[PDB]
């Protein structure tokens, strides 16, 4: 599996799933300043959709 696909260049995750850890627990907006609090309601952005391109279509086809 890993440590061999990474050596040979075969498709593999960038970070080994076994050597992976979560990021613990962060501020809960009750121990945070006002400027670092997540908004209560999701905000419309006009950048909320990912931009289409050739690379995504070709990668999905090659994954199929």
């Amino acid at each position: 599996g890993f440590e061999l696909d990474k050596k040979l260049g075969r498709p593999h995750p960038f970070i080994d799933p076994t050597k992976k850890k979560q990021i613990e627990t962060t501020l809960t907006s009750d121990e945070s300043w006002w400027n670092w609090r997540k908004p209560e309601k999701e905000q419309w952005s006009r950048w909320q959709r990912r931009r289409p391109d050739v690379e995504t279509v070709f990668l999905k086809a090659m994954a199929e």
Binding site: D30, E31, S32, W33, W34
Partner: protein, 90 residues
């Protein structure tokens, strides 16, 4: 002068120093902008206002003071300044 101007404001223009109940953000803005633009805060009131920006710190402080949150919220709406002499209705 700034003793008769205030009296004239009170009498002719209805001025009164009503209590402004502020959020921690507005209180910190008032207490911290009195020092400078980007300076290490030195006045203890500004330091306390900076600490109160996190409600967790406020909860720990009120727990140390041994009082619940509800009347601490009610403690905000207290009339500041001097009190008038009591009424002797004869």
């Amino acid at each position: 002068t700034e003793d008769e101007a205030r009296r004239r404001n009170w009498i002719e223009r209805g001025w009164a120093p009503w209590e402004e109940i502020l959020t921690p953000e507005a209180d910190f803005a008032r207490k911290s902008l009195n020092e400078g633009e980007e300076v290490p805060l030195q006045s203890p009131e500004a330091i306390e206002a900076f600490k109160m920006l996190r409600p967790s710190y406020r909860k720990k402080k009120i727990k140390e003071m041994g009082i619940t949150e509800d009347e601490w919220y009610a403690k905000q709406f207290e009339i500041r300044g001097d009190k008038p002499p009591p009424l002797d209705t004869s």
